[PDB]
Design an enzyme around this catalytic site. Structure first.
Site, short mmCIF file in Angstrom:
data_model
loop_
_atom_site.label_atom_id
_atom_site.label_comp_id
_atom_site.label_asym_id
_atom_site.label_seq_id
_atom_site.Cartn_x
_atom_site.Cartn_y
_atom_site.Cartn_z
N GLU A 82 -26.39 -65.12 -24.53
CA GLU A 82 -27.29 -65.80 -23.58
C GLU A 82 -28.54 -64.97 -23.28
O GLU A 82 -29.30 -65.25 -22.36
CB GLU A 82 -26.54 -66.09 -22.28
CG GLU A 82 -26.05 -64.83 -21.55
CD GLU A 82 -25.78 -65.11 -20.11
OE1 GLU A 82 -26.75 -65.16 -19.34
OE2 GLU A 82 -24.61 -65.28 -19.74
N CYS A 116 -21.63 -66.95 -21.03
CA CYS A 116 -20.55 -66.05 -21.03
C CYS A 116 -19.44 -66.75 -21.72
O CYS A 116 -18.77 -66.27 -22.61
CB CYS A 116 -20.21 -66.09 -19.56
SG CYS A 116 -21.18 -64.85 -18.80
N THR A 158 -22.99 -55.17 -11.18
CA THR A 158 -22.16 -55.89 -12.13
C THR A 158 -22.73 -56.01 -13.55
O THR A 158 -22.21 -56.80 -14.31
CB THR A 158 -21.92 -57.34 -11.63
OG1 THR A 158 -23.17 -57.90 -11.23
CG2 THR A 158 -20.93 -57.36 -10.48
N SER A 208 -20.77 -69.54 -7.38
CA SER A 208 -20.38 -68.63 -8.46
C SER A 208 -18.86 -68.64 -8.69
O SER A 208 -18.37 -69.20 -9.69
CB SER A 208 -20.89 -67.18 -8.22
OG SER A 208 -20.23 -66.47 -7.14
N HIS A 246 -12.21 -64.08 -18.90
CA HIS A 246 -13.60 -63.60 -18.82
C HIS A 246 -13.70 -62.57 -17.66
O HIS A 246 -13.11 -62.75 -16.60
CB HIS A 246 -14.57 -64.77 -18.67
CG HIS A 246 -15.99 -64.38 -18.38
ND1 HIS A 246 -16.71 -63.51 -19.18
CD2 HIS A 246 -16.82 -64.74 -17.37
CE1 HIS A 246 -17.92 -63.33 -18.65
NE2 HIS A 246 -18.01 -64.08 -17.57
N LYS A 255 -8.42 -62.24 -8.65
CA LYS A 255 -8.37 -63.54 -8.00
C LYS A 255 -7.94 -64.60 -8.98
O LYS A 255 -7.09 -65.42 -8.64
CB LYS A 255 -9.71 -63.90 -7.37
CG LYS A 255 -9.92 -63.41 -5.94
CD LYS A 255 -11.27 -62.77 -5.81
CE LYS A 255 -11.47 -62.25 -4.37
NZ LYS A 255 -12.52 -63.01 -3.52
N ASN A 325 -19.82 -56.13 -16.86
CA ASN A 325 -20.06 -57.47 -17.46
C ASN A 325 -20.66 -57.44 -18.87
O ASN A 325 -21.75 -56.81 -19.11
CB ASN A 325 -20.91 -58.43 -16.59
CG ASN A 325 -20.63 -59.95 -16.92
OD1 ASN A 325 -20.16 -60.33 -18.04
ND2 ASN A 325 -20.92 -60.81 -15.96
N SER A 358 -21.32 -70.14 -16.75
CA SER A 358 -21.88 -70.95 -15.67
C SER A 358 -22.72 -72.16 -16.18
O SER A 358 -23.16 -72.19 -17.33
CB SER A 358 -22.68 -70.06 -14.66
OG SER A 358 -21.88 -69.02 -14.08
C1 LIG Z 1 -20.70 -63.86 -14.38
C2 LIG Z 1 -19.76 -65.06 -14.38
O1 LIG Z 1 -19.32 -65.57 -15.64
S1 LIG Z 1 -19.05 -65.73 -12.87
C3 LIG Z 1 -19.00 -64.61 -11.47
C4 LIG Z 1 -20.24 -64.56 -10.54
N1 LIG Z 1 -21.31 -64.15 -11.44
C5 LIG Z 1 -21.97 -63.01 -11.60
O2 LIG Z 1 -22.82 -62.91 -12.49
C6 LIG Z 1 -21.67 -61.87 -10.66
C7 LIG Z 1 -23.01 -61.33 -10.15
N2 LIG Z 1 -22.69 -60.71 -8.89
C8 LIG Z 1 -22.93 -61.14 -7.67
O3 LIG Z 1 -23.54 -62.18 -7.44
C9 LIG Z 1 -22.40 -60.20 -6.61
O4 LIG Z 1 -22.09 -58.93 -7.23
C10 LIG Z 1 -21.13 -60.64 -5.87
C11 LIG Z 1 -21.32 -61.99 -5.16
C12 LIG Z 1 -19.95 -60.77 -6.86
C13 LIG Z 1 -20.86 -59.48 -4.91
O5 LIG Z 1 -20.79 -59.86 -3.53
P1 LIG Z 1 -21.62 -59.09 -2.37
O6 LIG Z 1 -22.29 -60.12 -1.49
O7 LIG Z 1 -22.34 -57.92 -3.00
O8 LIG Z 1 -20.56 -58.32 -1.45
P2 LIG Z 1 -19.22 -58.91 -0.77
O9 LIG Z 1 -19.37 -58.52 0.68
O10 LIG Z 1 -18.96 -60.32 -1.25
O11 LIG Z 1 -18.22 -57.85 -1.40
C14 LIG Z 1 -17.67 -58.00 -2.68
C15 LIG Z 1 -16.18 -57.63 -2.52
O12 LIG Z 1 -15.96 -56.27 -2.15
C16 LIG Z 1 -15.19 -56.26 -0.92
N3 LIG Z 1 -15.65 -55.03 -0.27
C17 LIG Z 1 -16.85 -54.83 0.29
N4 LIG Z 1 -16.86 -53.54 0.67
C18 LIG Z 1 -15.69 -52.97 0.29
C19 LIG Z 1 -15.14 -51.61 0.38
N5 LIG Z 1 -15.88 -50.66 0.98
N6 LIG Z 1 -13.90 -51.39 -0.13
C20 LIG Z 1 -13.18 -52.37 -0.72
N7 LIG Z 1 -13.68 -53.61 -0.81
C21 LIG Z 1 -14.93 -53.91 -0.32
C22 LIG Z 1 -15.55 -57.55 -0.25
O13 LIG Z 1 -14.60 -57.80 0.77
C23 LIG Z 1 -15.43 -58.43 -1.47
O14 LIG Z 1 -14.10 -58.40 -1.97
P3 LIG Z 1 -13.01 -59.59 -1.75
O15 LIG Z 1 -13.54 -60.77 -2.53
O16 LIG Z 1 -11.85 -58.86 -2.39
O17 LIG Z 1 -13.00 -59.81 -0.24
#
Ligand SMILES: CC(=O)SCCNC(=O)CCNC(=O)[C@H](O)C(C)(C)COP(=O)(O)OP(=O)(O)OC[C@H]1O[C@@H](n2cnc3c(N)ncnc32)[C@H](O)[C@@H]1OP(=O)(O)O
Ligand SMILES: CC(=O)SCCNC(=O)CCNC(=O)[C@H](O)C(C)(C)COP(=O)(O)OP(=O)(O)OC[C@H]1O[C@@H](n2cnc3c(N)ncnc32)[C@H](O)[C@@H]1OP(=O)(O)O
Lengths: 450, 450
Positions: A82, A116, A158, A208, A246, A255, A325, A358
């Protein structure tokens, strides 16, 4: 043509990487927000010297050589990706540079696109080709190549990069279970690339992971049904030795597998004991949309899944946790991770694969592994890939140099007429690596070796 | 699964077009430089209301309805194109809008990319899928969609736009000759899209036509060899009732077929009489590269080919001459052109197809046509497509309004947050047409019907 699937595979990822702890420090993340929260250890990135083409040449050259396959014997060659560097000239045509030396130009296939998921699409297209009335008897070869990058914000951590090559043919150690699979496809706007000029995606998170799960639920139900037809029983998490997903980041792998377990509930299958039924039934009153949305349901699900996850999923996580990733190549890196750790136990096992992209394209599918002569054997594949050796040939960057590099790469994406600066970088790459030397004023690209 | 190929097809092109004579006048071209020099009559273009997605919805909706096929019966759906609006979200996911109404989301396939060749790649991938151990018994559906545009200069007159849909399945009126085909693939820089932000290609002409011909020569030799194996004789231009080519502009269709004839010379085959041998032998001392390069050799070749070209090629030219370059869909428009003119003579004939895409991906392949029940019949396909009716529903623009439109489209390519201006345009489109209503500030797209 019988027992078609994957005869041989090999992988490449840039040796240049940044440590996640160090990066929490560099951003102002709370401690372990990348290592635990995302589940990630280390992140590999292209410098100016590398890209999806150079990576792809590395994986192909490496597969060919080490598996003693000769290049006239490739009759279909397809690329999933991609990462677009040209809007019309496919990465497949660049790879043809490698075949022009032995004069093999009768080679079908182009690039497959969707987020992906393009690699999966290619590898299916190849399986179907070996099985088709038009097969000329030769091997197919599939490449998964990508370079994951985000802007500054929360999604940067990521990223990842890698190319993966798979040789496709009959009498394989890794055999497709032809009918055992389900797809889900939809029109959504969870993650996409509408910025023609940017390397970076537009990413919603409140879809997402929703859409990953919507799709996973649906591909899972469809594989379940096909299994009840074929084998005469309800499918549950027990009916496969391994689930490989993936792997955008490890948290989501956790999850996702948890979710399978929660789906096994919904259907009363034979992997939900008396006590799980107890723990789950608080939640049976949730709307479907409600079930995607519940942080309590996740906790409960992950917690129920932890020992199953150690047997069926932990061994698929080495590479993804250490590189990041890999988009199209991510699933197939997780699969290599599983061949590396468990190859001696795999003969006769069922590995189930889930691919996602996606915009919303997805397929769960099933593989039956087995015993077979070198060079086309589970042990030989673990040996050639040499995951350990490669993890050891890495070269760390301070989060600061990483940032600077990201900035540079922002400037060269879609640019013309530069020569790449080799000082202190070229020496960092394995002997025989392909690297971008320069881009001329007509955007034509020129690659070096060694 | 037997006698797999094309069960049904349908076509769409924007009704909005500009006349070539008028355009010579508007540029300062010498008289007949487009009509004779390029060989072109009329040029269809997307206004702001149309694009490859809206076109694609038109062809799919139209195939489904008029051929009485129900949407649950599509099990693979693939799109060929080189017009990218999103770098990761495929056109295939947009088409899923149409299947979400009947709840059919288990549908394989993504987009295939390489220049005027992605559609072919898709249609092969679909043929292979019906023939594969993973086929679920349902129809495949292939879309060719594109919108050809150039900058101001000399290449503008060769634009076009169209979507084409093909239904794929066993017991077809249009059957693939599985083994009869040759591909050539290479790494060249004849035509490409390195300008991420532009709709327009970078195009060399001193390779453009060279590479088309290099590839045609090579695909031709490879089909020849496969024929000598299969049928026990040397292939010549007599061994097929029709040659249908990728049709960027008609002049090149003429040269290409001429070239087949010149290749028949090189091999002494049974379609080169005493007197052609005479006319050709002046040129047998040319290097290969010299033969691509010789304006005298062309003249001689075209001249020798003129009556053969009237029997075997002229009837494939209606649509291409009247709509213009259709990139992925161009070949398949030429094929529709042939079904429209000659369907009553086609039962039992051999039609040979040549597909091409710059960067350099190409396949010549062969089809055996025949007699079969409606709705899956040569006559019924000519009736549903209704080429005549559609050519009559057009709406001419003065070259000046065309230019203004080109300018507008330059501004909306890769842009966000606008609403399309419907006045005086919406009324120009057929009842039931899909049109772009608006693009929001997150680049999400929204389409209307009627
Ligand atoms: C790529 C695909 O094919 S699909 C997947 C989505 N696509 C992507 O391209 C991923 C791109 N990434 C993103 O958009 C971002 O990195 C996200 C949304 C995944 C990250 O979320 P953010 O808003 O940065 O932080 P968020 O507060 O959601 O924290 C991420 C996780 O860490 C946890 N966390 C945060 N701080 C801590 C810490 N200090 N210790 C342990 N866990 C923590 C959060 O609770 C959450 O985990 P959970 O889901 O187990 O509760
Ligand atoms: C798209 C593909 O899959 S491959 C094909 C190349 N790709 C494309 O995308 C085409 C894009 N188009 C272009 O780049 C340009 O339109 C070109 C190169 C095809 C046109 O060439 P130009 O430089 O505009 O003009 P040129 O002088 O070559 O004239 C074109 C033709 O018209 C002829 N001609 C010029 N004037 C006249 C006239 N008044 N009457 C008759 N013929 C004329 C020329 O002699 C030439 O024809 P020939 O090949 O039969 O000799």
């Amino acid at each position: 043509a019988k027992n078609v699937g994957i005869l041989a595979m090999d992988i490449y990822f840039p040796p240049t990487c940044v440590q996640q702890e160090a990066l929490e420090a560099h951003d102002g993340a709370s401690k372990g927000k990348y290592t635990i929260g995302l589940g990630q250890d280390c992140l590999a990135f292209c410098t100016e010297l590398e890209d999806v083409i150079s990576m792809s040449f590395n994986a192909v050259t490496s597969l060919l050589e080490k598996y003693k396959i000769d290049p006239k014997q490739i009759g279909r060659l397809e690329v999933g990706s991609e990462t677009v560097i040209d809007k019309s000239k496919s990465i497949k045509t660049f790879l043809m540079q490698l075949f022009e030396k032995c004069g093999n130009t009768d080679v079908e296939g182009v690039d497959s696109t969707n987020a992906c998921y393009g690699g999966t699409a290619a590898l299916l297209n190849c399986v179907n080709w070996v099985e088709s009335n038009s097969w000329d008897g030769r091997y197919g070869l599939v490449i998964c190549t990508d370079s994951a990058v985000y802007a500054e914000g929360p999604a940067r951590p990521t990223g990842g990069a890698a190319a993966i090559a798979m040789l496709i043919g009959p009498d394989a150690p890794i055999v497709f279970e032809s009918k055992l699979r389900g797809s889900h496809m939809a029109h959504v706007y969870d993650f996409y690339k509408p910025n023609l000029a940017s390397e970076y995606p537009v990413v919603d998170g409140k879809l997402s992971q929703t859409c990953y799960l919507m799709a996973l639920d649906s591909c899972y139900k469809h594989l379940c049904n096909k299994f009840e037809k074929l084998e005469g029983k309800e499918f549950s998490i027990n009916d496969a030795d391994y689930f490989v997903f993936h792997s955008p980041y490890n948290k989501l792998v956790q999850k996702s597998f948890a979710r399978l377990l929660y789906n096994d509930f919904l259907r009363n299958a034979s992997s939900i004991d008396e006590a799980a039924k107890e723990k789950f039934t608080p939640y049976s009153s949730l709307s479907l949309d409600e079930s995607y949305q519940s942080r309590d349901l996740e906790k409960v699900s992950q917690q129920l899944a932890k020992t199953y996850y150690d047997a069926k999923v932990q061994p698929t996580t080495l590479v993804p946790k250490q590189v990041g990733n890999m988009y199209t190549a991510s699933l197939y890196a997780a699969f290599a991770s599983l061949v590396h750790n468990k190859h001696s136990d795999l003969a006769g096992k069922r590995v189930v694969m889930f691919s996602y992209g996606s915009g919303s394209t997805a397929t769960m599918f099933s593989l039956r592994l087995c015993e077979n002569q070198s060079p086309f054997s589970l042990s030989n594949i673990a040996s050639v890939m040499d995951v350990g050796g490669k993890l050891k040939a890495r070269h760390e960057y301070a989060p600061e140099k990483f940032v600077e590099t990201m900035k540079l790469m922002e400037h060269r994406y879609g640019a013309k007429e530069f020569v790449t600066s080799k000082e202190g970088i070229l020496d960092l790459l394995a002997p025989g690596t392909y690297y971008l030397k320069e881009v001329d004023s007509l955007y034509r690209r020129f690659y070096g070796k060694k």
